[PDB]
Amino acid sequence: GSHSMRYFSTSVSRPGRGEPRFIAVGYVDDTQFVRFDSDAASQRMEPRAPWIEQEGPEYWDEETGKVKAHSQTDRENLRIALRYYNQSEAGSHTLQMMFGCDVGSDGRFLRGYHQYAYDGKDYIALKEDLRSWTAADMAAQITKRKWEAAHVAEQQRAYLEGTCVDGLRRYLENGKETLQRTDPPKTHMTHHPISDHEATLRCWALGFYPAEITLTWQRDGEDQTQDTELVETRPAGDGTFQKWAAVVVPSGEEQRYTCHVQHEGLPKPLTLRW
Amino acid sequence: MIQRTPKIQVYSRHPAENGKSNFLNCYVSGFHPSDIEVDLLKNGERIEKVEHSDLSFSKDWSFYLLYYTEFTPTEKDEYACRVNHVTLSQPKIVKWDRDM
Amino acid sequence: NYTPGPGIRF
Numbered sequence: 001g002s003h004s005m006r007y008f009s010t011s012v013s014r015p016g017r018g019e020p021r022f023i024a025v026g027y028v029d030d031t032q033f034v035r036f037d038s039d040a041a042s043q044r045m046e047p048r049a050p051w052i053e054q055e056g057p058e059y060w061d062e063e064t065g066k067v068k069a070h071s072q073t074d075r076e077n078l079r080i081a082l083r084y085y086n087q088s089e090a091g092s093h094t095l096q097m098m099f100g101c102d103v104g105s106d107g108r109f110l111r112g113y114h115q116y117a118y119d120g121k122d123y124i125a126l127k128e129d130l131r132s133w134t135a136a137d138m139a140a141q142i143t144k145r146k147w148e149a150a151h152v153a154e155q156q157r158a159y160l161e162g163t164c165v166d167g168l169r170r171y172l173e174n175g176k177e178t179l180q181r182t183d184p185p186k187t188h189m190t191h192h193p194i195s196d197h198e199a200t201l202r203c204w205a206l207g208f209y210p211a212e213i214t215l216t217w218q219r220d221g222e223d224q225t226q227d228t229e230l231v232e233t234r235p236a237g238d239g240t241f242q243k244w245a246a247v248v249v250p251s252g253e254e255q256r257y258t259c260h261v262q263h264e265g266l267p268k269p270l271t272l273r274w
Numbered sequence: 275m276i277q278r279t280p281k282i283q284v285y286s287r288h289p290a291e292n293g294k295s296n297f298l299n300c301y302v303s304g305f306h307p308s309d310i311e312v313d314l315l316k317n318g319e320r321i322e323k324v325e326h327s328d329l330s331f332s333k334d335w336s337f338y339l340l341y342y343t344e345f346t347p348t349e350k351d352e353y354a355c356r357v358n359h360v361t362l363s364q365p366k367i368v369k370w371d372r373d374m
Numbered sequence: 375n376y377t378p379g380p381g382i383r384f
Contacts, residue, residue: 025328070381
């Protein structure tokens with residue numbers, strides 16, 4: 001089906017403790033493939049997936065250059081934002097960036113992204129049309145005007161539709177065994193008494209890939225969203241994911257409940273009963 | 275400026291089987307800012323060989339990290355993760371329950 | 375593949 005490539009960068013200032021730390025990671029779908037850490041000894045973009053190791057010296061040289069350039073730009077951006085907002089140099093601040101592209105099941109460009117957040121809130125983002133910017137506040141409006149003058153939208157659109165898509169397609173082929181796979185969830189149900197009046201029914205999904213999943217409980221076929229404990233989808237550590245959903249069941253009412261599972265690896269949605 | 279509390283989960287990679295090699299995970303997610311401290315504990319004591327994933331984040335900008343170590347669970351051995359973050363009044367200990 | 379430089383600052 002569809003596929004994505006994303007890079008996520010985080011810059012964190014540390015007043016009185018030297019220059020900001022910069023960390024960037026690259027993903028294809030839910031599989032990480034590269035990292036760069038400004039605090040690390042190598043000072044190189046580093047492999048984080050078996051299928052990226054094939055890439056030659058020119059790749060590592062080029063990618064290292066690009067990510068290092070970004071690290072320096074965001075160091076400057078942190079200083080610029082401090083000035084824009086008149087914030088104290090004593091406080092630590094965070095600048096996050098995400099960029100990348102989606103392709104369809106045929107490998108055609110589908111969507112592109114290029115966006116920043118400052119202290120955990122949206123700062124500026126390239127709109128879906130890849131032609132205009134969304135600016136969160138007056139500070140970001142200054143940045144928007146600069147980027148319009150400099151034609152950043154056109155430059156990034158060219159990357160997103162071109163190199164981004166080409167790279168994603170190449171990785172999808174080289175890592176096809178890992179990337180073009182669906183591991184369906186293995187599902188089951190556990191029962192945990194809490195008192196003689198109540199018990200927990202927990203519905204599990206284990207060993208699934210990609211991470212996207214829907215796990216819900218129904219009572220008499222009715223919505224239970226507000227009465228279900230749903231944990232965040234979590235990595236197993238082996239390239240697969242896990243999740244559970246729980247409801248508190250009154251004694252002897254177990255049979256009124258059904259667990260529902262939707263995943264790309266399941267030809268039909270599952271219905272599970274205790 | 276914003277603050278978001280980490281959601282903490284401690285769990286094994288595979289369903290626990292006494293005497294069988296496994297991995298013990300602590301997954302912290304949904305937090306902000308990014309500074310966070312995680313220990314894995316065996317019978318109340320810090321485990322030494324603990325690795326972690328590279329800092330990344332979700333669509334809402336909140337950070338997530340996986341801390342992990344190889345372990346062979348037994349009947350009696352107790353495991354936990356201990357987490358500190360600016361949003362927590364004190365370090366929070368979550369015990370490993372082989373059933374969550 | 376990473377985005378190319380140069381970054382236009384804020």
